[PDB]
């Protein structure tokens, strides 16, 4: 119950000794630690330090754990005062968590997993990207009407696979731990499985995801979509409810019309999709006065359905964008 | 007029005793309550508590009712100080209102109205959703050109009605009070009235609203639209003024043209709607130099007309979204 | 130079007497006014009032005019403290301006200019709106292919003019001052000038603006557009620069093509407009590889050109919207 | 170690003399400078000045360089206190940088480079703009089907070049320094190089950029795009990844269809572009159930791809817009 006066650059703080003794590990909790700052003429402990920060420090003793940075104190200045008062590593990491902060194969694992290290590391990454870009150009040219080791496309297709196999064999016996959690390598597995044929071709387009390893923004978008599936799927659900709603509204408004462009419900789905997203079908346009109305409400409700979950998904992207800079 | 000194962890507060006696129910208003905190050596009442919060507490006595949380004090910390100073339940609920905060049938009413309680409660809700989803699929398949108890659709249509009647008979004699205010049950009434035929079919599509009971976001959007009708209808009115304006501007610009695609005013309405919402008609495009101009101004003014009331409606949605989490 | 101590509910303020005597009209500047608050035991002036507000009050004496409300003090509380310290009507109105705040014919001028006064005032406004809405419906029906005092439209056209003349003759000899500045009456003049015929018809559509007097949001949008012409016209200029830019880019990319859909520069203007506003022409689509590219860049740059000046115009609207509530 | 008490209008500040002596150039660091403010009755230095500002001033001595304006202190008031305490020109310019702040030919260089100086300076700028606007109108009329010194267009084309040469010869021997860094003159060079012919015509359209010198907003947009290329190019990259992704998804979904509108991968690129930007092709619309799905996901992912990097680019524009006012 013994009173303790703490002078912070002229700002007076008073408390009970039992409140500071609650945490015997810190500065003000250890009598031998705070001894060097005692003023025997005023019976107080003087500190020639920042003043707005000490409101939360002394409250960390009163509350017995709570360490909230004041809204007017900078983040770096308050964090450097916690080091001086020695509140503890447990309370320091809780402050960051509350603020928002989470030989034979060692050299080959430097110019491949972290291509920003050495000199040849930054060049072998460009060559690996050129193989990917040509791998994408090769996939887009295997279908032209002109074009539809001897096969003129089997010379570059395998050449990229030889490099895409060279981007996997050097990463299995040189990785830290034996790997399937990192999605960067799951893409390397789906880019190297051309051993049902159409499903493997739709699976073959996943070689575009090979750029995510070497791209700055692709990593940011990947974290955004994962950290937004609730509001990301909320759009898909809100659009599903509206498509079923408005495709049926235009169908009953254009049912007695012998030349009504909407024959059934599912045939009016794609019309409601491009009218909500405001893309524009060009084909199925309404003809009935009531059907024309339904199209107007389908375009108005479309902008609302889209623009509601977007700011949340935009905010998740702008956070990871700035945090990675 | 007797002066009273209040020491808050070193922060000095002075007032007149009549100001604290204005509220005899609280701590500082009751002399017997504040007796335990008096310091007879300094003639003051000491409190080893939070310091930035007491500005508003002592002002609650001076203003005689006003209790405004300081902008730099957290919401939980300030609210816990009101409990200590015992300002009263009337002033506490006014603070929340000012901040923004509003046997035979008892067990059957748990696995139906609150399907998150028991184990079988969370399974009977999934079965009830599967019936709804099949009920929606059934409505969309009763119109295909191929398909247009013996009727192949009368086997699932009634089967869902048997379940949709099973989702109403168990809720009338098991509800708390006899019900028409909760819109969740008005949908159950409009999903069970298939006892003018086309109007009942347009009324039949309202079975999609049955998902609002089991959906998280549908409840949020429903509250959003109700709490936004002024700005929601402001869009409909702003778009009505512009459609009448620009449909007449393109009609007089394309009147002497014998092959002008716009014959009258109402026939140019749907063109102005999809050009403001930027959907794209594909059919009626302008042909005259002046009519081409009108279409350009109709698309520019459309983005403005849409994007003005949207942020308000988005803010109403993002509030109910986060408040329900 | 005589020192003056001012005690604000325990918060100590010191200054020189010449600083308070700088404004002899206020409380602390008048010795007879502040006499009632002097404490002859401490040699200070005590005030049992708000504490965070007095930082700016005492600075109003030091700065000699500046009166800035603190960011943590509410607007109503700080404004009520200026009344107590009696800083003057000149400094009070400067604070509002700095914060953001600007018989025979007397009874007939109440149920017409302010239709919210009496009972019959709120009914005669509805009848005046029904005449306007029918006046708009009449204008839209004078052009149907079926329809294209004896003239079936001359019975309602003049009947609304009789009312639109009844909404002008009662406002010239009953107005406060003889009127042309208020744009509400300029619309009444352009709705009553049907005494070159096509220009008067395009001028006749301005009868839709008659709703601005009785509409809540139309007044808000009118103030928004006037308070945004710089950024409103900035869009028109940014779109003008892009239309000329991209219409020429697609024309040179599709010049050697004998069947290029773009014959000249001005014939590609409307394509660039609906591709920037993302409306969709449906007619003129690019055919050349380079022309296809130009269309892609014209759609990307369109969203940027639109979305830059929009938030400013949206902010001007959301300010007048909330300020009128 | 000698203690120093600083009284700021009643607010008490204490520190060690060695902390103020750390900067011997300032007021409180120079004993002769602060001598005029010493109170020999209280042993303190009194200042009749602003109170919330001195937290950062005294911390500038403790931190030994850091000068951060408090979040509640206005920018002008805090900056005027730094002048009084005389912290130094080095710390003052660091505060602005931390806040966000960077005869025979002398008279001819006033009515040309700064056309806001004299009277004839503001008129010769309008004539120079009329030549540019006619130069733009001339370029748009050299291609009409009607029109496709004797050449009817060689009379205005050279007349503008004579003026565009008059806007370069007077700026080379009258400029401050001999010029290629300022992009305003690089446009004057690309507007005066009509001395491969089609490439010079696509290079000739760059005469629209001549308006950037005399336009307020064109300068703001130019700074915006340069200060946004990372997020500006991030859109181009995000759209490139999606176009390749969805053009291949619709091609494999519409491959067995003999009348599939998408013959190859590159022929489906422009469809994915206008469906992501929601422009609307009107030509290539999907026909297969799977292809219809791909178009729906291509329109949903398009709004997301567009709306993510837009707020960053909008914020860069709104900063330069307000900073230039
Ligand atoms: K469109
Ligand atoms: K659109
Ligand atoms: O379209």
Largest interface: A-B, 57 and 54 residues
**N-C termini distance of chain A:** 50 Å
| SSE series of chain A | EEHEEHHHHHHHHHHHHHH
Shape assignment of chain A: flat
Order of strands across the widest beta sheet of chain A?
A: 2-1-4-3
Could you say which structural class the secondary elements and strand pairing of chain A correspond to?
mainly alpha
Strands of chain A, count: 4
The fraction of residues assigned to DSSP E strands of chain A is 5-15%
Fraction in helix of chain A = 40-55%
- What compounds sit in this structure? potassium ion, oxygen atom
The helix count of chain A comes to 15
Based on CA atoms alone, the radius of gyration of chain A comes out at 32 Å
Could you give a short account of the major beta sheet of chain A? 4 strands, mixed
List the quaternary state of the chains: part of a larger assembly
Topology (SSEs and partners):
The structure is cut from a larger assembly and holds four copies of chain A (325 residues).
Chain A (H helix, E strand, L loop, with lengths): L2 E6 L2 E6 H4 L17 E2 L4 E4 L6 H10 L11 H11 L3 H11 L10 H4 L5 H23 L12 H13 L2 H4 L10 H8 L6 H8 L11 H11 L2 H25 L15 H8 L12 H19 L2 H14 L2
Parallel strand pairs in A: 1-4
Antiparallel strand pairs in A: 1-2, 3-4
Helix pairs in contact in A: 6-7, 11-15, 12-13, 12-14
The structure holds potassium ion (K) (2 copies) and oxygen atom.
PDB class: transport protein, oxidoreductase
Keywords: Ion channel, C-type inactivation, Voltage gated Potassium ion channel, transport protein, oxidoreductase
Entry title: Crystal structure of Voltage gated potassium ion channel, Kv 1.2 chimera-3m
